[PDB]
């Protein structure tokens, strides 16, 4: 009879979804996860991230 009196209020809004331009969906600036752009048969790497 005393659980007639209760209250409820909404859960907090939480909007989830991808970053501003897909920020950090590619590893940039992380060594050991570097990108590669190189000649197929010459293999001279030409991406260096610091």
């Amino acid at each position: 009879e005393i659980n007639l009196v209760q209250q409820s209020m909404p859960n907090r809004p939480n909007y989830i979804g991808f970053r501003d331009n897909f920020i950090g969906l590619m590893y940039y600036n992380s060594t050991g996860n570097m990108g590669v752009l190189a000649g197929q048969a010459s293999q001279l790497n030409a991406v260096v991230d610091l």
Binding site: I23, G24, Y27, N29, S30, G32, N33
Partner: protein, 50 residues
């Protein structure tokens, strides 16, 4: 910046400063900044806006 610090020490070696432009600076929070030294941080418990 330790918690409750009011001074930040900066140390830069002797270097040539030819073709130096300005400085820019801003303050961040530790928990809102991930480390890019590794590709996974088990201590990044923040999913908000970085």
């Amino acid at each position: 910046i330790p918690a409750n610090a009011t001074n930040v020490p900066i140390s830069i070696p002797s270097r040539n400063w030819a073709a130096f432009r300005g400085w820019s600076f801003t303050r961040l929070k530790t928990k809102e900044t991930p480390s890019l030294g590794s590709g996974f941080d088990p201590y990044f418990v923040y999913s908000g806006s970085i």
